[PDB]
Amino acid sequence: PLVVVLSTICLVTVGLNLLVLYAVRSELHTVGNLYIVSLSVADLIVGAVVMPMNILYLLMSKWSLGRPLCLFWLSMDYVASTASIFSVFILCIDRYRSVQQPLRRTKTRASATILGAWFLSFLWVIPILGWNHFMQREDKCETDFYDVTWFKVMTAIINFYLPTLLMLWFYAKIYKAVKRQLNRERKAAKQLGFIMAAFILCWIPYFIFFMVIAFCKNCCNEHLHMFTIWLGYINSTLNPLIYPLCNENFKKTFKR
């Protein structure tokens, strides 16, 4: 019942993101829409590499995937999540730059910034790779730290709440700059705000959920845990679904 729904979700996500990539390569193709490629590839990663592993983990309780396989799937999960987060962050920082800095280039620095974001995302693999090797179960497919709670909550902090406040600060700065300067820019701000809202609304449930469950006595809510997992994955799917409806140009692009 659920497995077919999640498989349909995966196929829709991969297909729509592949069509987005095909549209990007076919034509756009400028300073505008410069980092939505990063969101598209992040969604490709999360869908393609996590969703099959997630449905395998979910169809029954505790199928073991293999120790290196579980490590690598967890690594892709976390690095793709943080890469998408900071990809939105650097997209917003570049929009702020494009709107304010030329008062006081973009193409050549965009590649450097995206590779830097990818590198800072992929340095997250090292904590997972080494926990007892240098920094002193098999049926389970967590292979992470549960006993230490403050490290987990600190990781949650640095991966969600600091980017959230950076998003809010940048949104306020953009709004104030637009107000003091004065329809196309209004539409761009509206689509960015809708992406931010979908992001926050449909990724906050699991984040706060395991923030509370990082330590509790009523932590036995695994069904709602997996519900929030597939909810967040749906949000990752629908970010490139909220995106196309706002822009008419790329709308006509994928109409082809």
Author numbering: 29 to 55, 58 to 134, 139 to 170, 176 to 221, 408 to 481
Paper text:
Enabled by our recently developed method, we successfully solved the structure of H1R in the apo state. The determined structure shows that it adopts a typical inactive conformation in the apo state. Finally, the model of H1R in apo form contains residues P29-E55, L58-R134, R139-Q170, R176-L221 and N408-R481. Interaction with a G protein appears to still be required to stabilize H1R in a fully active state. In the apo state, TM6 and TM7 appear to adopt an intermediate conformation, and this conformation is induced to move in opposite directions by inverse agonists and agonists.
When activated by histamine released by mast cells or basophils, H1R can cause allergic and inflammatory symptoms and has therefore been extensively targeted in the development of antihistamines.
